[PDB]
CSV table of C-alpha atoms in Angstrom, one decimal:
chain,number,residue,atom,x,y,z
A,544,UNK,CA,73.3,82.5,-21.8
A,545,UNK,CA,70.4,84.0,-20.0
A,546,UNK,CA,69.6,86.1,-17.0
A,547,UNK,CA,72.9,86.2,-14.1
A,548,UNK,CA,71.7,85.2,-11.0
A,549,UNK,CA,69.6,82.2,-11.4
A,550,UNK,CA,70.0,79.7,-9.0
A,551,UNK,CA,69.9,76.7,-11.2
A,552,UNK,CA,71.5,73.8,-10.6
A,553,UNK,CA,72.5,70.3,-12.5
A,554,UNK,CA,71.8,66.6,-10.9
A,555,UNK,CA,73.2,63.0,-11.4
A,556,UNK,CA,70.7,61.1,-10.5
A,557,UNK,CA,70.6,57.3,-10.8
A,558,UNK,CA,68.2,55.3,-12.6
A,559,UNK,CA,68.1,51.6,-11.6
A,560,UNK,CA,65.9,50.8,-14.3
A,561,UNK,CA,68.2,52.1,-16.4
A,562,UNK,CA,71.4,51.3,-14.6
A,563,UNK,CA,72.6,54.9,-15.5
A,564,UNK,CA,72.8,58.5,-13.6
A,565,UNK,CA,70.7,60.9,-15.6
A,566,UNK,CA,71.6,64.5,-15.6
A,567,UNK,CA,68.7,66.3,-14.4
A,568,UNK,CA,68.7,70.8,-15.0
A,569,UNK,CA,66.9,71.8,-11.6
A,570,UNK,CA,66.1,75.4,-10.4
A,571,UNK,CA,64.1,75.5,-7.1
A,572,UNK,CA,61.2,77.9,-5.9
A,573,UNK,CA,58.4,76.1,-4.8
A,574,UNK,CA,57.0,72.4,-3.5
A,575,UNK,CA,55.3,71.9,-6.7
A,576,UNK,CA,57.2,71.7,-10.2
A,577,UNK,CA,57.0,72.3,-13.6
A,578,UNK,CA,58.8,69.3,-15.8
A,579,UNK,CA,59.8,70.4,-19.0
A,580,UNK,CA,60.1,67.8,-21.7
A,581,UNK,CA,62.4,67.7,-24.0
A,582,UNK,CA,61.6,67.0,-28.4
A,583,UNK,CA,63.2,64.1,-30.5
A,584,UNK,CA,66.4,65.1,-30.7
A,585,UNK,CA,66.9,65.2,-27.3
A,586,UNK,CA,70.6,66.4,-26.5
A,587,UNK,CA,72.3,64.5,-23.3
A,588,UNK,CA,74.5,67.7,-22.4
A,589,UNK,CA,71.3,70.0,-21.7
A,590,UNK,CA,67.7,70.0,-22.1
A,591,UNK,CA,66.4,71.3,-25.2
A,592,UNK,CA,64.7,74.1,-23.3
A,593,UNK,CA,67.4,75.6,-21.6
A,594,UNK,CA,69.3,75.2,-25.0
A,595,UNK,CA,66.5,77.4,-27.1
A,596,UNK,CA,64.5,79.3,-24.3
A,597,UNK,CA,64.6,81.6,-21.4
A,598,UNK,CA,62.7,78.9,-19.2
A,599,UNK,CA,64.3,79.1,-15.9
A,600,UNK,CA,63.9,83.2,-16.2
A,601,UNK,CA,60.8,82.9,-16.7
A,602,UNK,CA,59.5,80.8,-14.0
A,603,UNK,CA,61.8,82.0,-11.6
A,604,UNK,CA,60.2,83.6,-8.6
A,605,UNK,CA,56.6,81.9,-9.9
A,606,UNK,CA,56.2,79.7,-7.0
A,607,UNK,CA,57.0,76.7,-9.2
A,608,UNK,CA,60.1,75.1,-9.2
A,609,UNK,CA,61.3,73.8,-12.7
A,610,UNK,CA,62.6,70.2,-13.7
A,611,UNK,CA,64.5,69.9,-16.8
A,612,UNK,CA,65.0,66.3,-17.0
A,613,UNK,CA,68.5,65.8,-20.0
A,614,UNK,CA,68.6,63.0,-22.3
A,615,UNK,CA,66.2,60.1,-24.5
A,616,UNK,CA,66.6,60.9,-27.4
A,617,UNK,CA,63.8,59.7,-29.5
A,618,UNK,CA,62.5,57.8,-26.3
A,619,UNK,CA,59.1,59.5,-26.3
A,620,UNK,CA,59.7,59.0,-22.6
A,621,UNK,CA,58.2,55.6,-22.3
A,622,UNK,CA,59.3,52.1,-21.3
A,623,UNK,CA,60.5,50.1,-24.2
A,624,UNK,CA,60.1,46.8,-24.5
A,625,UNK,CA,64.2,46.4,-25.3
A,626,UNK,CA,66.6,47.9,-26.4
A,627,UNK,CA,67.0,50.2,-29.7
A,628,UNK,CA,67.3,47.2,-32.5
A,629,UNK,CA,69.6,48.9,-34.6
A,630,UNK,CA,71.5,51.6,-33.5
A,631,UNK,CA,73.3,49.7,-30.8
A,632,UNK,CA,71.6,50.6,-27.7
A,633,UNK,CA,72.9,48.5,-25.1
A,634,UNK,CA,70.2,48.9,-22.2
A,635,UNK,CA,66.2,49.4,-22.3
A,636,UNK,CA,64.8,53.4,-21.9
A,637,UNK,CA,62.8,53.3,-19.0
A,638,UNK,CA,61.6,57.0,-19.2
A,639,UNK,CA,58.5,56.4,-17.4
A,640,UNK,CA,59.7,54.4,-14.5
A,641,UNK,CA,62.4,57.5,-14.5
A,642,UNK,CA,60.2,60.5,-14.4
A,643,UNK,CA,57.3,58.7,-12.2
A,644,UNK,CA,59.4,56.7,-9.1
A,645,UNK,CA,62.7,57.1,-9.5
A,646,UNK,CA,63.3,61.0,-10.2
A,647,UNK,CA,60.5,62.1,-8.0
A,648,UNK,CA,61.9,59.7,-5.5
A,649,UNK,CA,65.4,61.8,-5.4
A,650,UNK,CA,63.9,65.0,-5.5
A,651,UNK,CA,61.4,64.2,-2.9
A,652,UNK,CA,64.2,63.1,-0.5
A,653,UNK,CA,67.0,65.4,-1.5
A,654,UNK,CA,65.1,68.5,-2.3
A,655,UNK,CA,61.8,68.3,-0.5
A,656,UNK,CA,59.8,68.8,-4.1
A,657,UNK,CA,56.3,67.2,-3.7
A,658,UNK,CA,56.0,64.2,-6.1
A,659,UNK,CA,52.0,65.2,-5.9
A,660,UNK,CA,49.9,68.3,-7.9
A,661,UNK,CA,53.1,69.0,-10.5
A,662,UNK,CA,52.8,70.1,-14.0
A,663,UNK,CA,54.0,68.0,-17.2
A,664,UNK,CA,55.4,70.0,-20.3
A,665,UNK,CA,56.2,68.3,-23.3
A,666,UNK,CA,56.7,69.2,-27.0
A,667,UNK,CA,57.1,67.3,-30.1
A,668,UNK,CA,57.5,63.6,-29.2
A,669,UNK,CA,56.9,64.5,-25.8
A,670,UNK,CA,53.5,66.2,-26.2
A,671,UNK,CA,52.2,62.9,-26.1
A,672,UNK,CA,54.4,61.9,-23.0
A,673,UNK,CA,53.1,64.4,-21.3
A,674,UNK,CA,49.4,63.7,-21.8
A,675,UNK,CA,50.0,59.9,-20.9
A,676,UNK,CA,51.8,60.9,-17.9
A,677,UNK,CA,48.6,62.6,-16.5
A,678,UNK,CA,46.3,59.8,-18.0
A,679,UNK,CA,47.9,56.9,-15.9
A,680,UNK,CA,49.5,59.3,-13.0
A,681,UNK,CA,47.0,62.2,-12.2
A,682,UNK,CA,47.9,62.5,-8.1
A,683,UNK,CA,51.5,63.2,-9.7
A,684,UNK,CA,50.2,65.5,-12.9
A,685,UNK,CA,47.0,67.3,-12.5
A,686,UNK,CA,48.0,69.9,-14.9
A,687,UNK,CA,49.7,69.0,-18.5
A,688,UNK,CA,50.6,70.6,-21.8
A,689,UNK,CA,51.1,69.4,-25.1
A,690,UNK,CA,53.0,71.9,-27.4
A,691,UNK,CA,53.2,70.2,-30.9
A,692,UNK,CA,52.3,66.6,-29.6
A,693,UNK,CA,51.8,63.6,-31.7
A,694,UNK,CA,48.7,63.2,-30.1
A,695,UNK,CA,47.2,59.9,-32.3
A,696,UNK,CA,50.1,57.7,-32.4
A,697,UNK,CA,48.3,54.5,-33.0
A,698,UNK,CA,46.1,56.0,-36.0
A,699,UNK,CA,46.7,55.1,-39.8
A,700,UNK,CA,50.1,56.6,-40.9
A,701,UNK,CA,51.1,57.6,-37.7
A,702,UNK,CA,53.5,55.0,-36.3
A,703,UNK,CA,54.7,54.7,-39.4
A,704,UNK,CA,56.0,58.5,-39.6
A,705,UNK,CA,56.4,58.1,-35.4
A,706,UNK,CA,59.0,55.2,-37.1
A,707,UNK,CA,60.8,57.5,-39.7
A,708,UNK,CA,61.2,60.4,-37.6
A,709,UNK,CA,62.8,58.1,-34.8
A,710,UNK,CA,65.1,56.6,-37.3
A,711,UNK,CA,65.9,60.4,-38.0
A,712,UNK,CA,66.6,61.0,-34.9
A,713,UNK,CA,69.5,58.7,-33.7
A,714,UNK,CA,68.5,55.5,-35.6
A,715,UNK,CA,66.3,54.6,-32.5
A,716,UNK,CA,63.2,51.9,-33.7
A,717,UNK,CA,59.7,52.3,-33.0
A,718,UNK,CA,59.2,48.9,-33.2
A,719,UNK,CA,61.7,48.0,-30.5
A,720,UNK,CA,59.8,50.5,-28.3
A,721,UNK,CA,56.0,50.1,-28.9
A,722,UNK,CA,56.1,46.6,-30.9
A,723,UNK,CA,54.6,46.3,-34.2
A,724,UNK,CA,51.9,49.2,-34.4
A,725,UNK,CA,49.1,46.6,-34.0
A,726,UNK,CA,50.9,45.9,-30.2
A,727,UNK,CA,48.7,47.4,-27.3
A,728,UNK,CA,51.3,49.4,-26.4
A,729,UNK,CA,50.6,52.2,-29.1
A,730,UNK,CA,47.1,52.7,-27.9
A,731,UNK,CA,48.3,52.3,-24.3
A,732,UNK,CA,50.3,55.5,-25.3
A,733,UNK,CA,47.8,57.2,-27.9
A,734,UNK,CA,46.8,60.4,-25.6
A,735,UNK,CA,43.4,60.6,-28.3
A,736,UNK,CA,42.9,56.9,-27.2
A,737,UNK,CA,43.2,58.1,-23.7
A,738,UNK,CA,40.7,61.1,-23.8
A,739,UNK,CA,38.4,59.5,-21.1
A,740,UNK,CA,40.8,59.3,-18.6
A,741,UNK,CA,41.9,62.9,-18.6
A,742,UNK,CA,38.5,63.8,-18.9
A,743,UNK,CA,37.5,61.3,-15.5
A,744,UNK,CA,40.8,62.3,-14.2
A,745,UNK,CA,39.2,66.0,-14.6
A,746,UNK,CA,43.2,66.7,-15.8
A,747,UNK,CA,43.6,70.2,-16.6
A,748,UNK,CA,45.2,70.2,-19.8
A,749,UNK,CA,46.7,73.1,-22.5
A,750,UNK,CA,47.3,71.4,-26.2
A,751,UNK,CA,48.8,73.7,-28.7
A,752,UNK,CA,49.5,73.3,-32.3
A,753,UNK,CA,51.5,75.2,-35.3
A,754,UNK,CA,51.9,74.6,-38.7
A,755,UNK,CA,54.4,74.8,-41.8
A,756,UNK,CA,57.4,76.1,-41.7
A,757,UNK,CA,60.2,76.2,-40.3
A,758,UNK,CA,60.1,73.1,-37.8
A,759,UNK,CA,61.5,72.4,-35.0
A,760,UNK,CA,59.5,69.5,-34.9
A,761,UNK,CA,62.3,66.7,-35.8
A,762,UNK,CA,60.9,64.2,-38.6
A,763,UNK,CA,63.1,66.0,-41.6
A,764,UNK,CA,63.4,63.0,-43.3
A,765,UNK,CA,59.5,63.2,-43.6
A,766,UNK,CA,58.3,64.6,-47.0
A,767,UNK,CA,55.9,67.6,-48.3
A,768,UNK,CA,55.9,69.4,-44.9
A,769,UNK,CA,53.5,66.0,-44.4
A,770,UNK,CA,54.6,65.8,-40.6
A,771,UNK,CA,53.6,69.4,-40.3
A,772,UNK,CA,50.3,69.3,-41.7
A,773,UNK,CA,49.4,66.4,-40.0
A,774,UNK,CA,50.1,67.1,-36.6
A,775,UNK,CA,47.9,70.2,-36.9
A,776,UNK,CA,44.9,68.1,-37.6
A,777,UNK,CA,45.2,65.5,-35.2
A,778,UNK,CA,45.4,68.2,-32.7
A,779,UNK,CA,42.5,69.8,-34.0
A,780,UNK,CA,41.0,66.3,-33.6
A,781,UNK,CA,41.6,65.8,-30.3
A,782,UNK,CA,39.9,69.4,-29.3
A,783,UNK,CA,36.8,67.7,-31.1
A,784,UNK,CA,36.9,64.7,-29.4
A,785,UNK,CA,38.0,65.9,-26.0
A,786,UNK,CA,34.9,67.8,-26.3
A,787,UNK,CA,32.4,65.4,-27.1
A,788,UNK,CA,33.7,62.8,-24.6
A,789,UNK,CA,32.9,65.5,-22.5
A,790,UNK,CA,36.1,67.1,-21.2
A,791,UNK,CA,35.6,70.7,-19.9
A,792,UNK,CA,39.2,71.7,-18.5
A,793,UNK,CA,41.2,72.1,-21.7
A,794,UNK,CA,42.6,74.8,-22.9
A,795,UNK,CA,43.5,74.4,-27.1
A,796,UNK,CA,45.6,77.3,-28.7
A,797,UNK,CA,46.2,77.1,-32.6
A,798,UNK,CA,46.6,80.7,-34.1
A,799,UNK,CA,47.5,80.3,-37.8
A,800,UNK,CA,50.6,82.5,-37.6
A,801,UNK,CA,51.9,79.8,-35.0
A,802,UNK,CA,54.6,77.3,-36.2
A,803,UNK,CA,56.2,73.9,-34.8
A,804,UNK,CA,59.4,75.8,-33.3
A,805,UNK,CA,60.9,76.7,-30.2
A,806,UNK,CA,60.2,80.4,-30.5
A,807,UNK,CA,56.5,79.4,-30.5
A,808,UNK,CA,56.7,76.7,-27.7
A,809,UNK,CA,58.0,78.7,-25.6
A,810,UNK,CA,55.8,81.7,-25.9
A,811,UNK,CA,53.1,79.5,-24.9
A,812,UNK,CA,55.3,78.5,-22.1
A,813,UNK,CA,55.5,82.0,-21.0
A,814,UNK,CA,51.3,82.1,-21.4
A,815,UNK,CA,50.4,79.4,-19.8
A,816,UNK,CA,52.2,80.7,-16.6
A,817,UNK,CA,49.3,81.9,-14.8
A,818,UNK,CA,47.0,79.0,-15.7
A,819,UNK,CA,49.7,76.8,-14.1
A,820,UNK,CA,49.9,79.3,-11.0
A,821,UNK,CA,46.4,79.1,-10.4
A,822,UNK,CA,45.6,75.5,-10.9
A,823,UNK,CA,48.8,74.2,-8.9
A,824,UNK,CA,48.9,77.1,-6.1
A,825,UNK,CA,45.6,78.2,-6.5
């Protein structure tokens, strides 16, 4: 329950990648769009934000129009290479073929929403997503935020807890998504990998980061609040090194009192407003 009077909507849209409608929460405003990613555990009734957060109030009457795509659970919105191997999965995730032709496709042709200058939102597993989204798609997402990404996923222990806390999360399998963490897919995918292009790509990006307790994060299965901890310093990281490959449209938030939770994700939401206003409308 939120504010009366919103005119949001809900959408079937198909997915011939995916050979599937996916339900898309929609509330219009604007040419240019906002798409809200949703974290690991990923519902398929609503989108975790409109679930936990006064989104669509808060970015109603911004200008923006605001895409809330629902579903893909522990997909990190991605192409797989097959099917789940375990959990009996009986088609591929083709997230990024979704969000990048197919979606904007409908909405362009439906809706009039530009599938040019839009924002990408992601948190948790799709923190990364939305980074990789503007690395390989900047005409469609000049501006992108990263609230509690993975942002390392090829590094040392990282597909391995990117593989536990998949597992977690509807038995999904990292390997049948990304290969074996040697494949090139992980680095393909590894937004720290991919610093150069958002910084070519002159992407303006806002990366935040909590830490400890409680999380929102997904990974439970994780132990030590290890998940936690290290998804603060990889972010931290990737400030550094966003830096000295010479990036200089970032924005990096991590106040210690911050945690990995939706009350957190979507204040910055709510801050990062303005910066989206001004970089996407001018």
């Amino acid at each position: 329950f939120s504010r009366p009077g919103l005119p949001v909507e809900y959408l079937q849209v198909p997915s011939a990648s995916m050979g599937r409608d996916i339900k898309v929460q929609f509330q219009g405003g604007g040419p240019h769009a906002v798409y809200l990613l949703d974290g690991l555990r990923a519902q398929d009734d609503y989108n975790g934000w409109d679930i936990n957060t006064p989104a669509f109030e808060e970015y109603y009457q911004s200008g923006l129009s605001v895409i809330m795509p629902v579903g893909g659970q522990s997909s990190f919105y991605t192409d797989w290479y097959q099917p789940s191997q375990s959990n009996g999965q009986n088609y591929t995730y083709k997230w990024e073929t979704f969000l990048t032709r197919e979606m904007p496709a409908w909405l362009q042709a439906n809706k009039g929403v530009s599938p040019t200058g839009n924002a990408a939102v992601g948190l948790s597993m799709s923190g990364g997503s939305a980074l990789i989204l503007a690395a390989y798609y900047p005409q469609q997402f000049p501006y992108a935020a990263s609230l509690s990404g993975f942002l390392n996923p090829s590094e040392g222990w990282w597909p391995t807890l990117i593989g536990l806390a998949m597992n977690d999360s509807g038995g999904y399998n990292a390997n049948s998504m990304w290969g074996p963490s040697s494949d090139p897919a992980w680095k393909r995918n590894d937004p720290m990998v991919q610093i150069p292009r958002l910084v070519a790509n002159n992407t303006r990006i806002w990366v935040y980061s909590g830490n400890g307790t409680p999380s929102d994060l997904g990974g439970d299965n994780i132990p030590a609040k290890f998940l936690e901890g290290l998804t603060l310093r990889t972010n931290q990281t990737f400030r550094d090194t966003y830096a000295a490959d010479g990036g200089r449209n970032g924005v990096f938030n991590f106040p210690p009192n911050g945690t990995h939770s939706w009350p957190y994700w979507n204040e910055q939401l709510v801050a990062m407003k303005a910066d989206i206003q001004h970089v996407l409308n001018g």
